[PDB]
């Protein structure tokens, strides 16, 4: 099929975003950090320079995919994956 490759049809994973010191997001396993930062900005009317996505107080790289975050930091743990974001 000519469009079976769209991200539309990828497996989905569930995230919870709490503010570093509450939102729930589902996306493709191939969605990258930069895309999720992209989404926060619109919701908060901010610019990427001022939104950072973190896990265990480490900023995650923009090109890492949700599935790599999950398997390196969340394997064996139930949904959803808990991530932090900060505003600076």
């Amino acid at each position: 099929h000519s469009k079976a490759h769209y991200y539309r049809y990828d497996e989905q994973l569930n995230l919870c975003l709490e503010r570093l010191s509450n939102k729930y997001v589902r996306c493709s396993v191939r969605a990258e950090v930069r895309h999720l930062r992209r989404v926060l900005c619109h919701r908060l009317m901010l610019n990427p320079q001022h939104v950072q996505l973190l896990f265990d107080n480490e900023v995650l790289p923009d090109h890492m995919t949700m599935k790599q975050i999950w398997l390196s930091r969340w394997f064996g743990k139930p949904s959803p994956l808990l991530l932090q974001y900060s505003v600076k």
Binding site: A4, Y7, L13, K23, V29, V39, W70, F75
Partner: protein, 105 residues
């Protein structure tokens, strides 16, 4: 070919990536019983009121097989006669109270 994100202030139903037919590519589905419970609608009213939503069935062993290969679902998270499914699409997500956002790559 863009990314679509589902957003909500409350936890979201689980979806499962399944190929329901040799004639269709894999895509995402909800458990039909979960969509009804969130909506507080009966199967009858849901299908009468929203006929364009796709409801399909697959054997319980075929569903568990396609879902057991995931490294994301844990044993406890794996459900499992048949299993009833409604397809994952923006219209159903908005009905469930979520917002949709399309992010380009």
């Amino acid at each position: 070919d863009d990314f679509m994100f589902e957003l909500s202030d409350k936890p979201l139903l689980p979806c499962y990536n399944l190929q329901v037919s040799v004639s269709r590519g894999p895509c995402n589905w909800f458990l039909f019983s979960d969509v009804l419970k969130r909506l507080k609608l009966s199967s009858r009213i849901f299908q009468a009121r929203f006929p364009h939503f796709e409801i399909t069935t697959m054997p319980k062993a075929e569903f568990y097989r396609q879902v057991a290969s995931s490294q994301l679902l844990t044993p406890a998270e794996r459900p499992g006669e048949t299993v009833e499914l409604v397809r994952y699409e923006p219209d159903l997500l908005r009905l469930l109270g979520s917002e949709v956002e399309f992010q380009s790559c």
